[PDB]
Each structure stands twice: as C-alpha cells, then as structure tokens.
Amino acid sequence: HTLVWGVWVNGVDQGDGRNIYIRSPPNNNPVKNLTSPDMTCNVDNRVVPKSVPVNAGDTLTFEWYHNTRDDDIIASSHHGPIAVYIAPAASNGQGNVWVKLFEDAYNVTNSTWAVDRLITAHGQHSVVVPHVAPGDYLFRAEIIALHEADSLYSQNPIRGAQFYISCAQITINSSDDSTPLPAGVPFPGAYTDSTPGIQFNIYTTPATSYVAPPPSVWSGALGGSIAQVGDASLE
Ligand SMILES: O[C@@H]1[C@@H](O)[C@H](O[C@@H]2CO[C@@H](O[C@@H]3CO[C@@H](O)[C@H](O)[C@H]3O)[C@H](O)[C@H]2O)OC[C@H]1O
Ligand SMILES: O[C@@H]1[C@@H](O)[C@H](O[C@@H]2CO[C@@H](O[C@@H]3CO[C@@H](O)[C@H](O)[C@H]3O)[C@H](O)[C@H]2O)OC[C@H]1O
Ligand SMILES: O[C@@H]1[C@@H](O)[C@H](O[C@@H]2CO[C@@H](O[C@@H]3CO[C@H](O)[C@H](O)[C@H]3O)[C@H](O)[C@H]2O)OC[C@H]1O
Ligand SMILES: *[C@@H]1O[C@H](CO)[C@@H](O)[C@H](O)[C@H]1NC(C)=O
Ligand SMILES: O[C@@H]1[C@@H](O)[C@H](O)OC[C@H]1O
Ligand SMILES: [Cl-]
Numbered sequence: 001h002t003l004v005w006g007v008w009v010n011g012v013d014q015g016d017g018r019n020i021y022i023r024s025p026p027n028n029n030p031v032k033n034l035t036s037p038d039m040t041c042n043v044d045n046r047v048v049p050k051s052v053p054v055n056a057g058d059t060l061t062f063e064w065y066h067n068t069r070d071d072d073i074i075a076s077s078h079h080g081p082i083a084v085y086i087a088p089a090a091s092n093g094q095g096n097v098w099v100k101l102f103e104d105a106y107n108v109t110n111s112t113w114a115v116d117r118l119i120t121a122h123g124q125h126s127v128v129v130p131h132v133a134p135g136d137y138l139f140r141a142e143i144i145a146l147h148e149a150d151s152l153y154s155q156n157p158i159r160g161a162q163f164y165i166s167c168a169q170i171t172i173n174s175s176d177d178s179t180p181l182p183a184g185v186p187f188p189g190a191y192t193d194s195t196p197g198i199q200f201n202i203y204t205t206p207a208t209s210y211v212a213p214p215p216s217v218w219s220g221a222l223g224g225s226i227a228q229v230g231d232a233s234l235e
C-alpha cells in the first residue's frame with residue numbers, strides 16, 4: 001500500500017504533486033485485475049492541471065510514501081520489482097504505447113528486492129529522461145508486490161500480484177530527439193496470467209530465479225537507480 005507524493009528533477013523537489021501533476025488515485029489500494037483499465041494509470045485516470053518541465057538527460061525521481069511523506073514507504077512484506085514506463089500524453093495511455101525505461105527486480109549481491117531498497121531510499125527511485133521528441137509525456141511508475149503472487153487474481157480474487165501504479169505528467173522541453181520513442185506495449189494487455197514474473201512464489205523459489213515481466217528495457221533508455229536524491233525532511 002503506497003502512493004507517489006511528487007517528483008524531484010536533478011535533485012530538486014518539485015513539490016506536492018498529488019492531483020496536480022500526478023494522476024493520483026483516492027487511496028493506496030493495489031490494482032490486481034490485469035485486464036482492467038485501472039492497469040493504465042490506476043483508478044482515477046484523468047488529466048490533472050500541471051505537467052513537470054524537464055529536459056532530456058535530467059534525473060527524474062519518483063517519491064513514494066505509505067500514509068504520510070517519508071514514512072515507512074511500503075510494508076516490508078511487499079517484496080517485488082519496480083519498473084518505469086513512458087508514453088506520449090496524446091495517447092492517454094491507450095494502445096501499444098508504453099516503453100520501458102527501467103527495471104529492477106532482485107539484487108543478488110545485496111540479497112534485496114527492489115522494494116526493499118526503495119524503503120531504504122526513503123521512497124525514491126529515478127530514471128534519466130531519454131532523448132525523445134520534445135512534448136508531453138506520461139511516466140508510469142509501477143511497483144509489483146509479490147507476497148500473494150503464488151495465486152492468480154483471476155482465479156482467487158483475494159490473492160494475486162499487487163500493482164501500485166502512478167502516472168506523472170512530464171513535459172520534455174529541450175531534447176535533440178536522438179532516440180525517437182518507439183512502439184510500446186499496452187496496459188492493460190502486456191501482463192497476462194502466463195506472463196513471466198506475474199505468478200511466482202517468493203517464499204520457496206529462490207529470488208535469483210525470478211524473471212520480471214517483459215517487455216525488456218528499451219535500448220534508448222539512459223538508466224536509473226533506487227536511491228535517495230533528496231531529504232524530504234528539509235522543507
Ligand atoms: O512463512 C511463510 C508464510 O508467511 C507464507 O505466507 C504468506 C505470508 O504473507 C501473507 O500476506 C500478508 C497479507 O497481509 C499483509 O498485511 C501482510 O503484510 C502480508 O504479509 C500471505 O498472504 C501469505 O501467503 O507462506 C510461506 C511460508 O514460508
Ligand atoms: O490481498 C489482500 C491483502 O492485501 C489484505 O491485507 C491487508 C491490506 O490492507 C492493509 O491495511 C492497509 C495498510 O496501509 C494503510 O495505509 C491502508 O489504509 C490499509 O488499508 C492490512 O494491514 C492488510 O492486512 O488482506 C486481505 C487480502 O485479500
Ligand atoms: O473483489 C473483486 C471486486 O473488487 C471487483 O469489483 C470491482 C470494483 O471496482 C469497479 O470499478 C469501479 C466502477 O465505478 C467507477 O468507475 C469506479 O471508479 C471504479 O473503481 C470494477 O469495475 C469492479 O470490477 O469485482 C470482482 C470481485 O472479485
Ligand atoms: C477485470 O476487469 C475487467 C475489465 O473492466 C472486468 O470486466 C472484469 O469483471 C474484472 N474482473 C474481476 C475479477 O474483477
Ligand atoms: O473498473 C472501472 C471500469 O469498469 C471502467 O469502465 O473504467 C474505469 C475502471 O476504474
Ligand atoms: Cl503527506
């Protein structure tokens with residue numbers, strides 16, 4: 001159970017974005033139905049009044065929280081991967097439009113899942129803004145909590161993989177458009193019951209055997225990290 005408070009650009013807090021530049025749902029409940037339109041940008045997908053300005057090559061940091069800003073972020077039970085996607089705003093997220101910029105599942109060296117490191121990072125994870133065409137974009141940050149993902153929602157609606165999905169409105173101002181944005185995948189649609197990484201038992205299968213759901217990260221992506229960039233308690 002987690003939500004996005006706002007974003008930082010190049011280590012600078014953009015301020016509370018909830019219902020302003022983030023298409024915030026009413027609460028931190030997960031999405032679990034893979035075929036629901038809620039998979040696109042969560043349960044209240046509508047245009048919000050502002051878009052955060054960035055340039056290609058900037059560091060865009062999402063900041064998650066559980067109940068209040070910079071708290072325990074997400075229950076420690078909710079082990080799983082994190083991904084970030086981008087789509088043109090004109091799509092409203094519909095169609096084969098979502099391109100993956102970032103994926104982190106399990107770090108074998110540190111023996112930690114992405115969510116575990118997100119807690120340590122005070123809810124902060126980042127992507128580098130790609131060199132796509134200037135314009136309006138949706139960045140879709142997705143956490144998949146796998147604590148009940150041994151079951152499929154479609155079979156047992158009281159269990160299943162849990163998706164915490166947030167879409168931020170981002171405007172890319174300056175970019176040389178060196179890597180034009182390609183086709184992507186649909187949400188809902190990309191993930192189905194037989195997709196790798198959707199049904200998995202984290203208690204008895206080694207985490208080193210986990211494979212995150214496709215699609216693969218786009219070759220044009222510039223990287224990203226789960227790491228604190230700024231201190232929320234100073235502001
Ligand atoms: O010891 C292991 C068991 O714990 C495991 O069972 C799962 C434990 O986590 C359960 O999900 C909880 C739902 O309520 C949330 O508030 C909690 O944070 C979650 O932990 C899940 O439903 C159980 O299946 O089975 C394997 C054992 O090794
Ligand atoms: O799959 C279901 C589980 O997710 C459910 O576990 C409970 C889910 O709600 C948890 O309470 C939330 C904690 O965070 C607060 O901000 C929210 O307002 C609360 O809703 C609760 O602790 C879990 O036990 O159990 C039932 C399963 O079907
Ligand atoms: O537990 C499962 C139910 O939760 C599931 O019911 C969904 C409840 O939410 C509905 O969408 C709302 C419709 O009205 C507005 O658009 C709201 O904003 C939406 O949240 C879904 O359509 C239901 O499917 O049904 C199955 C049950 O097992
Ligand atoms: C999943 O979502 C689809 C699309 O809205 C809906 O028709 C179906 O009833 C949902 N299933 C469940 C189990 O909630
Ligand atoms: O579940 C809802 C669905 O029924 C509606 O058609 O689109 C919005 C969703 O939240
Ligand atoms: Cl708050």
Ligand SMILES: [Cl-]
Pocket residue numbers: 120121122226227228
């Ligand atoms: Cl950190």
Ligand SMILES: [Cl-]
Pocket residue numbers: 056057131174175176177
């Ligand atoms: Cl550039």
Ligand SMILES: [Cl-]
Pocket residue numbers: 199200201202205
């Ligand atoms: Cl498994």
Ligand SMILES: [Cl-]
Pocket residue numbers: 059126127128223224225
């Ligand atoms: Cl980064």
Ligand SMILES: [Cu+2]
Pocket residue numbers: 001002075078
């Ligand atoms: Cu939760």
